[PDB]
Design an enzyme around this catalytic site. Sequence first.
Site: not given
Length: 283
Positions: A182, A217-223
Site C-alpha cells: 500500500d 490504476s493510472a497505467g504509468i507507475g507500477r506498469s
Amino acid sequence: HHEMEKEFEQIDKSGSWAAIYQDIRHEASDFPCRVAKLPKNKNRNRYRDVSPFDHSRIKLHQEDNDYINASLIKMEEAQRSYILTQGPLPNTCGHFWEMVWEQKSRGVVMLNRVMEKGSLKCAQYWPQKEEKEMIFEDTNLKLTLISEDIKSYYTVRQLELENLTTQETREILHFHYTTWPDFGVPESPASFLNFLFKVRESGSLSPEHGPVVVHCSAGIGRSGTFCLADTCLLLMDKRKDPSSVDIKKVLLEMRKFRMGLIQTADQLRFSYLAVIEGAKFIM
C-alpha cells in the site's frame, strides 16, 4: 559501457535518487494529446494529467468514438511491444475488452488491487464467479471465468472472451500481481521478478499474439516498472555486452510512447534493483 550495480550503490550512498529521477522527468519528450483532451473524452480518463499521446494511442475500431486511455509502446531493439492502459472505469470496461479483442492480445497484466487503502483503483472488470458471466452490452462482448489459480503473490485466471456478434471466442490469460504494498515499493524485487517470468513463460509477451495489455490504476507507475524491467532484461540478453544497457535511456525511450512512466524516485530505484537482480538470476 555502464556499471549499473556500481552506479546503483553510489546513488544509494549519496542519496541521489530524487535528483536522478528529476533528470529523467526533465529530459522526457512531450507529444500532443489532443484526442484525450477532447470534451467528449473527459469521462474516459481516470486522471486529467495522465493521457495517451495521439501518435501512440490505441484506437478502438468504432466510428462513434475510438478513444481509450491506452498507449502502444514499441521497443525496436528489444523486439517487444506492450499496451499500457489505465485501470478500467465503470464506463470503459467494454472499451477495455474491445481493445483486447481488436488487438488480439493473449494476456492482461494487472498490477493493482481493485481496492487499495480504502480507495477504488479500478473497476471490477472481470467476473469473480465462473457461473456469473459479465456482459458488456456497449461493445458486444461477453466474458466468462474459466479458471482461477491463486498463488502467494499473484493469481492467474483464464477468461473466455466472446464476440457476441460473431460467436467467436478467445481465451485470455489474466496475470494479477496481488501484493504490491500500500505504501512505497516492494522491499525485494524477488516476487515481482518471479511474476514477470511467469508472464514471459505464458506466451502473453510473444510476437505470435497482439501486445500484452498492462495496467495498474493510472497505467504509468507500477506498469512502467514492469515494462522497463522486462525491456532492460531483454536487451541484456540480446547484446554482446549486457553492461552496455543504460536503464535511463531505455526509460526515456519508453516515455516517448506514454507519459510519466515510473512515477516516483522509489519506483525508479526499484526498477534498477529488479533489473540488477533479474540479470544475475538469468545469466
